[PDB]
Amino acid sequence: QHCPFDTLLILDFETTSDAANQDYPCEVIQFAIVAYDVPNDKIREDISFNKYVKPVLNRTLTKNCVDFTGIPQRSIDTADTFDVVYEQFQQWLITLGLEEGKFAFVCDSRQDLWRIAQYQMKLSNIQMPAFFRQYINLYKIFTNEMDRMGPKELSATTNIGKMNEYYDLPTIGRAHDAMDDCLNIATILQRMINMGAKVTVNELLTCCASWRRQPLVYNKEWRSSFMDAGKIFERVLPLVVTTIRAGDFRLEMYGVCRYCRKGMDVCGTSHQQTPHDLYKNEEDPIHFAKIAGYY
Template identity: 35%
Template sequence: MFGLRLAFGRIVSLHGWRLDLVSCHSRLHVYHKALLQVHIDKCCKMYVNQPHRSYQPVMPLYNQNYDFFLVLDFEATCEEGRQIIPQEIIEFPVIKVNARTMKREGLFHRYVQPTRPPSAFCTRLTGIMEEMLINQPPFRAVLMDFENWLIREGLIDKKIIFVTCGNWDLQVMLPDQCSQIHYPVPAVMKSWINIKKIFFTATGIFPRNLMHMLEILGLPHIGRLHSGIDDCLNTCMILEELARRGVVFHRTNNYTSPV
């Protein structure tokens, strides 16, 4: 994954940001949201949305069933070749997408401290090192922070829906994690769009994974596979491309608590 290095208050390069998170944690914590937004804009070859200007209007405007899409992709602890119990979320990224313009207008991104450190396999797969998680809040605090972010972004009274690549994030991982901490699954996170199902309806091809969809749509892959924030970025590109081709998105899944 591309990253950002900070020195003397400005961006100086785009290399190895995870190492910088370890060595420059306090500074990057202050600038975390701003740096990730720059990362999104750089990766997608967009102009940075500076405070004194706004993006130019995008044409055409899309007629969708929602006001905003919330593109989500968790990363969790894992082991090679076997399921671990409990599995714990260690990266919680969400990108807010305006359903009318398909522009990215907001970002929530947190790392989460698990009760047990990630395995060497997990670090190789996701790029998330134990040192990156040591000073991060536990899942309960991050989930509560996310619920507050929804309020700050003015999304509570809007028509919103989550977008995921598959059903694992909201059908399996979030309910399991909430069960571990005896915290109710937020109502807003009990329905979502599985973009793989929408892709199948639109193209007649059921995609194997994220990379397969990008390949079929002729889109480049951005960043690192299995980085949560990068997977969100790539899902955003698929979402936008399908909308450009005339797809109108609808809910594909609902979560029902097991009896």
């Protein structure tokens, strides 16, 4: 109906972390997808991908990480590295015969594709594919929907939590298992569609933004603030998030950078707005940028 895609792929990544430190080189440790069949309004749990991933930079999971994600150490010690798992994902995609630009990924925020996929793919030396450079931020649709229908007082802290609370849906499994997150998002998505939401891509990864032309005002305590760390990532990572209105999106924008209008084979091979102003303080280096090779 409203959704121009015939299939939606709900995606979730879990990463290595250390709660108290934002200057951390997050590596994917779980990669999960569930398919949603748009014309039939059906969640297809039988069409799914669920792999653990062995990190190479930080091989031992932090305790706060395992408490948060619920992933135990054993599951990543027996896992393949990202480059192998991503290849399996590419292969699995092919064995589903979807048409380029007729499926889109759905996430609960900008974190999975703008930050996590982008950063992991630098580590693994993989080109950001066109299907990650265009996606549905479900939480952005949700806030438009709240605005459209009627805001109410929410006490949940996570994106998934609030959406579940607002639509009055029971929490599935537990927070932060990648597959459980996927199922929650899928059930929310379905509900949003039944209530008349237009679910379509709303975020695009772009080589440039005029607001990056102004040097970031450096907050020296950024390493303990999620918001302030976000500002650093925005500058360090090549691709930036540009929003698009539902009515302005077209399926033919697939594979085409919204900013420079070139194909995504040419756009994205090198950073067009390298933050040299952040890179001259030898006294206070940005660890995640150093270890990935941004400088």
